[PDB]
Swiss-Prot record, chain B:
PANTHER family: METALLOPROTEASE TLDD (PTHR32194), PROTEASOME SUBUNIT BETA TYPE-7 (PTHR32194:SF4). Belongs to the peptidase T1B family. This is Proteasome subunit beta type-2. GO terms for biological process: proteasomal ubiquitin-independent protein catabolic process; proteasome-mediated ubiquitin-dependent protein catabolic process. The gene is PUP1. Disulfide bonds: none annotated. Keywords: Cytoplasm, Hydrolase, Nucleus, Protease, Proteasome, Threonine protease, Zymogen. The proteasome degrades poly-ubiquitinated proteins in the cytoplasm and in the nucleus. It is essential for the regulated turnover of proteins and for the removal of misfolded proteins. The proteasome is a multicatalytic proteinase complex that is characterized by its ability to cleave peptides with Arg, Phe, Tyr, Leu, and Glu adjacent to the leaving group at neutral or slightly basic pH. It has an ATP-dependent proteolytic activity.
Curated annotation (Swiss-Prot), chain E:
Belongs to the peptidase T1A family. The 26S proteasome consists of a 20S proteasome core and two 19S regulatory subunits. The 20S proteasome core is composed of 28 subunits that are arranged in four stacked rings, resulting in a barrel-shaped structure. The two end rings are each formed by seven alpha subunits, and the two central rings are each formed by seven beta subunits. The catalytic chamber with the active sites is on the inside of the barrel. Interacts with CIC1. It is found in: Cytoplasm; Nucleus. Coiled coil: none annotated. The modification Phosphoserine is found at residue 227. Its main location: cytoplasm. The gene is SCL1. This is Proteasome subunit alpha type-1. It comes from Saccharomyces cerevisiae (strain ATCC 204508 / S288c). Present with 15200 molecules/cell in log phase SD medium. Pfam families: Proteasome (PF00227), Proteasome_A_N (PF10584). The keyword Nucleotide-binding does not apply. The keyword Mitochondrion does not apply.
Curated annotation (Swiss-Prot), chain F:
The keyword Cell membrane does not apply. The chain holds residues 1 to 217 of 434 of the full protein. GO terms for molecular function: structural molecule activity. Component of the lid subcomplex of the 19S proteasome regulatory particle complex (also named PA700 complex). The 26S proteasome consists of a 20S proteasome core and two 19S regulatory subunits. This is 26S proteasome regulatory subunit RPN6. It comes from Saccharomyces cerevisiae (strain ATCC 204508 / S288c). The gene is RPN6. One of its GO terms (biological process) is ubiquitin-dependent protein catabolic process. The lineage of its organism: Eukaryota, Fungi, Dikarya, Ascomycota, Saccharomycotina. Component of the lid subcomplex of the 26S proteasome, a multiprotein complex involved in the ATP-dependent degradation of ubiquitinated proteins. In the complex, RPN6 is required for proteasome assembly.
UniProtKB/Swiss-Prot annotation, chain G:
It comes from Saccharomyces cerevisiae (strain ATCC 204508 / S288c) (Baker's yeast). Belongs to the peptidase T1A family. NCBIfam families: PRK03996.1. The proteasome degrades poly-ubiquitinated proteins in the cytoplasm and in the nucleus. It is essential for the regulated turnover of proteins and for the removal of misfolded proteins. The proteasome is a multicatalytic proteinase complex that is characterized by its ability to cleave peptides with Arg, Phe, Tyr, Leu, and Glu adjacent to the leaving group at neutral or slightly basic pH. It has an ATP-dependent proteolytic activity. It is found in: Cytoplasm; Nucleus. It comes from the Eukaryota. This is Proteasome subunit alpha type-3. GO terms for cellular component: cytosol; nucleus; proteasome complex; proteasome core complex, alpha-subunit complex; proteasome storage granule. Present with 17100 molecules/cell in log phase SD medium. The keyword Phosphoprotein does not apply. Keywords: Cytoplasm, Isopeptide bond, Nucleus, Proteasome, Ubl conjugation. The gene is PRE9.
Length: 242, 226, 196, 249, 241, 217, 244
């Protein structure tokens, strides 16, 4: 009863199949997004289940367009398919209007899409929360997208097992800078609170990945963090938690 | 044929002739060339006749729907827009030379539409083969802000000139006056300028002046009981 | 038919005739070709009447939806839709469209779209049939960044020569001024530019 | 995919197609509406109910026009009727304004609309609509007619009938008031009097919708000067006029 | 049984599955109020920002369907954006094929049919959002139409939405009984905004801020939104009355 | 159309502005005028169908009557106003006849005059007219017998309606009769069946369709 | 799901029998009686309505009788609503035969077609069958007058006289005992009325509850004239046979 499809509805006003899908991402990886003034900084915890893996080869950060970063948590194949559709959307906009799609526009379109699969018993919903953002001529934007098809403006967002650990620190970070803060400094921050959300993942070990889209350094394109900047961040977070 | 439409401040008048030619053969002495997309939206048609008649049937249904959905007076430009799109994808293989007239609560309107899907506006327009002859007479007498009576005349006279310098224009001149905020007044046979002259003797003959081979009776009145 | 648009200091002015021929008969001589697809981006029709009007309607339909979801279009954005429909009917439809608009993302812009469909940014644009005879005058007499009055008179003078040398361009000259001062429709009657 | 092409109408193990019986129940949960056939007109009447006191019953239409000379009125579900009246208009236009040209006979049109009801009890992904329609009309061939369309997809001509929650009481009311010869005026009085007993709110003429398919009226066509052609035999009575009628019961 | 799980009638003739759709718009705790002014239509609605970490400027319940028609939504946000999109496509559609902007009346009717179609299938979930469309039309004047999940719609003098909307309704009804007309008289739309706020504060028992409100105004030929600053201007004018 | 309107107006201004004795002459010509319309003496004074006039004439003839002033002329008028109702030969006579008697009830006349006029109506209602009508006019005569303080004449009339009109029964018109019946019994000073019939009236009014007057009673 | 809301309605049962067809026969026994008799001068179709109300107009009700073509008519017993669709399919199939062969359709062909549609509903699509039984009066030039009865399963069986609808048992036996093969249209007209008065769902058979129709070869040259009688002529013939 009311737990056999996504087009039953309960007298409670609740859809449980859809609610249940948020729990899928709750057993996913920890991922954070800091909304900056110049851009956005994403970071994602990559769990290490053995040492046979090859670190920074197993991508969860896919770029959509030349300027929208997307990183997702939850059931992995599902999230890769959600990004798959969104790349088609990027090309279509470019084809008709000859300009890269805006950040709010992309957010809109994905919401429609995730809506569609909770309206029919003939397609299965997704099991991912995605975090994406960027820079356009309306400014920097940050969005988190539920598998219900919900998004909002976000000063800071997180998801995964340690979404609680992450969000608690982001509140204090708006206390430190009530004027928002720079993307370049937020790289070091981004590492910091994944280490803090690895205290819920403290019977495992992790690989840290960081990606950024900022207008003040990378000219408003979405790129990866690597090399010297990366290891500075790794060192910072270590000493703090030690 | 000839169709004139004269827009003016207070309304619009559309007038047409009743001579139907196919080729240089005159199909009809009398025929109504004023057609109804909608009860407020009248047009008349020139060029080939079947194509005008067909497309106003087709768009009359679509507009009639729309008028029921809103439950109030249909806008003129709705008809305009739909005709244009329809004709455009045939690329003008359907010959419709319509003068589309109508009133609605966003003013008086007057449009013309071509086979290809061209549309013009004006405070007066003329179409058909006799358009040219009509033009001249109009442009002398026409003023800004005509009276309804004055406009009546000027329209009828312009068609009259069609009768005299064009061979698609003839028998009767009908007028329809559409005024904002009232009912459209259909003035059929407003001016009758030509009668068949009298003949000099009647053409009767007694019977069987034509030979007859055989005959039979043929009943359609029903079917039969016993 | 001739259409042009010319950039100036504070925005952009669009200029058109109002005569439309088919063959030797003028169908109407007071039909406005200046068309509004956004409050702030207007465009100019020339060539075959039906083709341009059809495309203009389609673009308005698409731009409406753009506004209601994503924010307003830019002059660029708008040009592309005209362009791409002309690219899909490049063997069928012959259309001259100039898309000009005043933004606050980009101040005044002129884009033009040929029959086959390409977009081209220019500091001035001309298109049609009659505007190719005024082409040389255009470039020799053009100035970058003129006064409002200087732009109005330049367009008036260009189209006077156009009407001179082309019988399909005639009637009134119609202009739209796009700015951050308002939107100003202007009209010049024939005696007024025959003096000059 | 598409795996809903199994009918959602079925039989019961005790006979009797169960789905259209449920759909017929929704009419007894619906509003009351009635039609009295006269011998020189037809009258149809319904009550306006809204879910708000700020709602406009001036943009609320429960009596709607199909063609000038034919009107319809429902009892049952609002939403169901809202789409169904559009489909009635659509088939009437595509099959009798593009093929036969003129406005159809009443008898014809009633049959055609019943076919759409039938085709919502055949296919999957569709269950039938749960309203009953009274289609009153006049054609110059079969005279005045009043018909009732079922949620089963059948039709019946009636002498006078009601549909809605008070239908059973109403046909008992009509038994003694009805006569084979009626005037149109007298019909109005009978119709509204029966519907006053099938409304348990207050009974106004601002909240009661009245329409006659009675006398022609030419000036509602849109033109005048050819009398061989008329305007609508349908004529909706404005509110103030209905108030005059409340006094005439 | 299983006439409550898919949209098939019961032995009462009732669709329980559809009724449940109404029961979900109370779960976001959003109220809206919309009244017809003298030359405007104002809708004021709650804006919940429960955290800092939500950026308040983005949290929008107001979607512009047309240039002239605003839409305010009460209920779950996925279904809101879904409904907005359908409506936007249809408005554009009609402008393209009929040569003017889609009437508010006809748009309401359109969404009503689509709602019925979502309850006509037996694997399609009704869109649970309640939609308010506000406009100033040039043929119907100031207008409010509220469509609902079942696919019923009706015009409106004024309307409210939310879990607490009976109270709001009570206030508005009494006002139009003293005034004896169906729209508020004033002559500056600004003061109709101010009046609407006063009634809302009375109804829900709470004074609102510039980020507890989000305000939309349709005047003639236009719809726009007030920024959070403009709203603070109004709350000073509460003092000034 | 203009002539019956003008004559009505003329009467009215004289009443309130000039003298009530000049209106008297116009009243008498007005009643005769009304007979011309009623017999179609030009086409009903509009030419060819009775069109508008059909309704108007009996409507302005009752507007005259209530205006008005208790006169012997007024009393005398009314006995022959029920022949004027048959003169038309129309089917709309049901609706107006009720208001006709009622206006005469309103004006003080005394024991005889109100009852005699109402009984006379019942005689024409069994001639050819509806079964609904007779019962209405019996209800009215019944009320009159009670007003004039006659309770044997009221009781006897009432019994034949209620007992035999279960074979001609759909009407909400028996609610009226039960309530009246209790009133009669009260003033015979027999409260046993006054109470029994009141309950029956209450239960028969427990279904919801009833006027405000009806509940007040 | 989508297989979650289907219990499988149009499979066979363990006696080889379709659930929906078996339920259908019961629902047609709810509906009014219709009897067909074949005389050696004609065919009589006679039908009693399943609805008769307070103020139902039955004076023009042509709601059981339908002309499929000018030599083939049907009597209907079952859902009137269900029957509609097949009635108009039949009109189309008949006119098609005339259009392409320039000849009137045989009775055999037309019935066999409609039966195929019924069979087709349980064969594919998950769809239910229309709960209808038809009695066909038809003339052809190859078997003369043909009488048929068809059932919701999609099978046809010939008869000399047959009954459908309510109270088929009682009617069938009485018809067997009283029918002779040398009866006329006159005799058959009276026999049908007597059988319908033993199966009337009221306690009396009335002229406005009767639809009565014939196909007679008394029309000249041996042509068949179909007649659906007026309500005054049914009343006319019902007093003649001495029911009323």
């Amino acid at each position: 009863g009311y737990d056999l499809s996504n087009s039953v509805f309960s007298p409670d006003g609740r859809n449980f199949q859809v609610e249940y899908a948020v729990k899928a991402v709750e057993n996913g990886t920890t991922s954070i997004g800091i909304k900056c003034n110049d851009g956005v900084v994403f970071a994602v915890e990559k769990l290490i289940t053995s040492k046979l893996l090859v670190p920074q080869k197993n991508v969860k950060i896919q770029v959509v367009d030349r300027h929208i970063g997307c990183v997702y948590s939850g059931l992995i194949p599902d999230g890769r398919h959600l990004v798959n559709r969104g790349r088609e959307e990027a090309a279509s906009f470019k084809k008709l209007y000859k300009t890269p799609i805006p950040i709010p526009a992309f957010a809109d379109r994905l919401g429609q899409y995730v809506q569609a699969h909770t309206l029919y018993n003939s397609v299965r919903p997704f099991g991912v929360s995605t975090i994406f953002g960027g820079v356009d001529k309306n400014g920097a934007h940050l969005y988190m997208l539920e598998p219900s098809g919900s998004y909002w403006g976000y000063k800071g967002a997180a998801t995964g097992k340690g979404r609680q650990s992450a969000k608690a620190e982001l509140e204090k970070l708006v206390d430190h800078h009530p004027e928002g803060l720079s993307a370049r400094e937020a790289v070091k921050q981004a590492a910091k609170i994944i280490y803090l959300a690895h205290e819920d993942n403290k019977e495992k070990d992790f690989e840290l990945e960081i990606s950024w889209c900022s207008l003040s350094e990378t000219n408003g394109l979405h790129k990866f963090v690597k090399g010297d900047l990366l290891q500075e961040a790794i060192d910072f977070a270590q000493k703090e938690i030690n | 044929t000839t169709i004139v439409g004269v827009k003016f401040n207070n309304g619009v008048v559309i007038a047409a002739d009743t001579r139907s030619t196919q080729g240089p053969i005159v199909a009809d002495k009398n025929c109504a060339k004023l057609h109804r997309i909608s009860p407020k939206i009248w047009c008349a048609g020139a060029g080939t006749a079947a194509d005008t008649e067909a497309v106003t049937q087709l768009i009359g249904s679509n507009i009639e729907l729309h008028s029921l959905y809103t439950s109030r007076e249909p806008r003129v430009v709705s008809a305009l827009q739909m005709l244009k799109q329809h004709l455009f994808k045939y690329q003008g293989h359907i010959g419709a030379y319509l003068i589309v007239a109508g009133v609605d609560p966003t003013g008086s309107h007057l449009f013309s539409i071509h086979a290809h899907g061209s549309t013009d506006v004006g405070y007066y327009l003329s179409l058909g083969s006799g358009s040219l002859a009509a033009m001249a007479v109009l442009e002398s007498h026409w003023k800004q802000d005509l009276t309804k009576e004055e406009a009546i005349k000027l329209a009828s006279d312009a068609i009259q000139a069609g009768i005299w310098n064009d061979l698609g224009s003839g028998s009767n001149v009908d007028v329809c006056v559409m005024e904002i905020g009232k009912d459209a007044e259909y003035l059929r046979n407003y001016l009758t300028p030509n009668v068949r002259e009298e003949k000099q003797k009647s053409y009767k003959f007694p019977r069987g002046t034509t030979a007859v081979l055989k005959e039979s009776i043929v009943n359609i009145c029903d079917i039969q009981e016993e | 038919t001739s259409i042009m648009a010319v950039t100036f200091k504070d925005g952009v002015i669009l200029g058109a005739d109002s005569r439309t021929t088919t063959g030797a008969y003028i169908a109407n001589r007071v039909t406005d070709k200046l068309t509004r697809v956004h409050d702030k981006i207007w465009c100019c029709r020339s060539g075959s009447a039906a083709d341009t009007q059809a495309i203009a309607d389609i673009v308005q339909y698409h731009l409406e939806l753009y506004t209601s979801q994503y924010g307003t279009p830019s002059t660029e954005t708008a040009a592309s839709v005209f362009k791409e429909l002309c690219y899909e009917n490049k063997d069928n439809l012959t259309a001259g469209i100039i898309v000009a608009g005043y933004d606050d993302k980009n101040k005044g812009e002129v884009y033009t779209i040929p029959l086959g469909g390409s977009v081209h940014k220019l500091p001035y644009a001309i298109a049609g049939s009659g505007s190719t005879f005024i082409y040389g005058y255009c470039d020799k007499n053009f100035r970058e960044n003129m006064s409002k009055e200087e732009t109005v008179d330049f367009i008036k003078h260009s189209l006077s020569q156009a009407i001179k040398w082309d019988g399909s361009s005639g009637g009134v000259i119609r202009m739209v001024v796009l700015t951050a001062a308002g939107v100003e429709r202007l009209i010049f009657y024939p005696d007024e530019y025959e003096q000059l | 995919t598409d795996r809903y092409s199994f009918s959602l109408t079925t039989f019961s193990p005790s006979g009797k197609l169960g789905q259209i019986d449920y759909a017929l129940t929704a009419v007894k949960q619906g509003v009351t509406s009635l039609g009295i056939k006269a011998t020189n007109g037809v009258v149809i009447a319904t009550e306006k109910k809204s879910s708000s006191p700020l709602a406009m019953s001036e943009t609320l239409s429960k009596v709607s026009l199909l063609t000038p000379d034919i009107g319809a009125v429902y009892s049952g579900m609002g939403p169901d009727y809202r789409v169904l009246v559009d489909k009635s208009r659509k088939v009437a236009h595509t099959s009798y304004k593009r093929i036969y040209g003129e406005y159809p006979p009443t008898k014809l049109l009633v049959s055609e609309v019943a076919k759409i009801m039938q085709e919502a009890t055949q296919s999957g992904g569709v269950r039938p609509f749960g309203v009953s329609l009274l289609i009153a009309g006049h054609d110059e061939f079969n005279g005045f007619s009043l018909y009732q369309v079922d949620p089963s997809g059948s039709y019946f001509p009636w002498k006078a009938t009601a549909i809605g929650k008070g239908s059973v009481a109403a046909k008992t009311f009509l038994e003694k008031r009805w006569n084979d010869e009626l005037e149109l005026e007298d019909a109005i009085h009978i119709a509204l009097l029966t519907l006053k007993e099938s409304v348990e709110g207050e009974f106004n003429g601002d909240t009661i919708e009245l329409a006659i398919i009675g006398d022609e009226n030419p000036d509602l066509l849109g033109y005048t000067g050819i009398p061989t052609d008329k305007g609508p035999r349908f004529r909706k009575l404005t509110s103030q006029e209905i108030n005059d009628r409340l006094e005439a019961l | 049984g299983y006439d409550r799980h898919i949209t098939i009638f019961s032995p009462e003739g009732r669709l329980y599955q559809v009724e449940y759709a109404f029961k979900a718009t109370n779960q976001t705790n959003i109220n809206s109020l919309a009244v017809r002014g003298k030359d405007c239509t104002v809708v004021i609605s709650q804006k919940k920002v429960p955290d800092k970490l939500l950026d308040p400027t983005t949290v929008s319940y107001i979607f512009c369907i047309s240039r002239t028609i605003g839409m305010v939504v009460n209920g779950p946000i996925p279904d809101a954006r879904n409904a907005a999109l359908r409506a936007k496509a249809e408005a554009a559609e009609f402008r393209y094929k009929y040569g003017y902007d889609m009437p508010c009346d006809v748009l309401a009717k359109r969404m009503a049919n689509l709602s019925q179609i979502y309850t006509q299938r037996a694997y399609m979930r009704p869109l649970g959002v309640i939609l308010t469309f506000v406009s100033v039309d040039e043929e119907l004047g100031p207008s409010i139409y509220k469509t609902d999940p079942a696919g019923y719609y009706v015009g409106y003098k004024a309307t409210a939405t939310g879990p607490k909307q009976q109270e709001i309704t009570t206030n508005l009804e009494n006002h139009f009984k003293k005034s004896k007309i169906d729209h508020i008289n004033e002559e500056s739309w600004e003061k109709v905004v101010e009046f609407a706020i006063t009634h809302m504060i009375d109804a829900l028992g709470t004074e609102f801020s510039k980020n507890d409100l989000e305000v939309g105004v349709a005047t003639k030929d236009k719809f726009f939104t007030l920024s959070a600053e403009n709203i603070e201007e109004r709350l000073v004018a509460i003092a000034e009355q | 159309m203009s002539l019956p309107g003008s004559k009505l107006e003329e009467a009215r201004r004289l009443v309130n502005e000039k003298q009530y004795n000049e209106a008297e002459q116009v009243y008498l010509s007005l009643l005769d005028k009304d007979s011309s319309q009623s017999s179609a003496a030009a086409g009903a004074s509009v030419d060819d169908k009775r069109r508008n006039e059909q309704e108007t004439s009996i409507l302005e003839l009752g507007q005259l009557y209530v205006t008005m002033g208790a006169k012997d002329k007024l009393r005398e008028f009314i006995p022959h106003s029920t022949e004027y109702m048959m003169q038309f030969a129309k089917s709309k006579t049901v609706k107006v006849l009720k208001t006709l008697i009622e206006k005469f009830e309103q004006v003080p006349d005394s024991l005889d005059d109100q009852i005699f006029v109402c009984e006379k109506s019942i005689e024409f209602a069994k001639r050819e007219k509806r079964v609904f009508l007779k019962h209405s006019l019996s209800i009215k005569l019944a009320t009159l017998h009670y007003q004039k303080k006659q309770y044997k004449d009221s009781l006897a009339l009432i019994n034949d309606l209620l007992r035999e009109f279960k074979k001609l029964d759909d009407k909400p018109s028996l609610v009226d009769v039960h309530l009246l019946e209790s009133k009669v019994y009260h003033k015979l000073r027999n409260l046993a069946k006054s109470k029994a019939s009141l309950t029956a009236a209450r239960t028969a009014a427990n279904s919801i369709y009833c006027p405000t007057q009806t509940v007040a009673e | 799901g989508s297989r979650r809301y289907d219990s499988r309605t149009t499979i066979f049962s363990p006696e080889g029998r379709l659930y929906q067809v078996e339920y259908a026969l019961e629902s047609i026994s709810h509906a009014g009686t219709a009897i067909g008799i074949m005389a050696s001068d004609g065919i009589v179709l006679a039908a009693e309505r399943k609805v008769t109300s307070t103020l139902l107009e039955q004076d023009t009700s042509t709601e059981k009788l339908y002309k499929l073509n000018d030599k083939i008519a049907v009597a209907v017993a079952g859902l009137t609503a269900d029957a509609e669709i097949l009635i108009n399919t039949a009109r189309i199939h008949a006119q098609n035969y005339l259009k392409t062969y320039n000849e009137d359709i045989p009775v055999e062909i037309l019935v066999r077609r409609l039966s195929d549609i019924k069979q087709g509903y349980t064969q594919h699509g998950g769809l239910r069958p229309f709960g209808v039984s038809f009695i066909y009066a038809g003339y052809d030039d190859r078997y003369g007058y043909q009488l048929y009865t068809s059932n919701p399963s999609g099978n046809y069986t010939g008869w000399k006289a047959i009954s459908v609808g309510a109270n088929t048992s009682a009617a069938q036996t009485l018809l067997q005992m009283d029918y002779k093969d040398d009866m006329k249209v006159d005799d058959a007209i009276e026999l049908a009325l007597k059988t319908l008065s033993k199966t009337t769902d009221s306690s009396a058979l009335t002229y406005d509850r009767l639809e009565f129709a014939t196909i007679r070869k008394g029309a000249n040259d041996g042509e068949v004239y179909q007649k659906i009688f007026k309500p005054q002529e049914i009343k006319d013939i019902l007093v003649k046979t001495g029911i009323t």
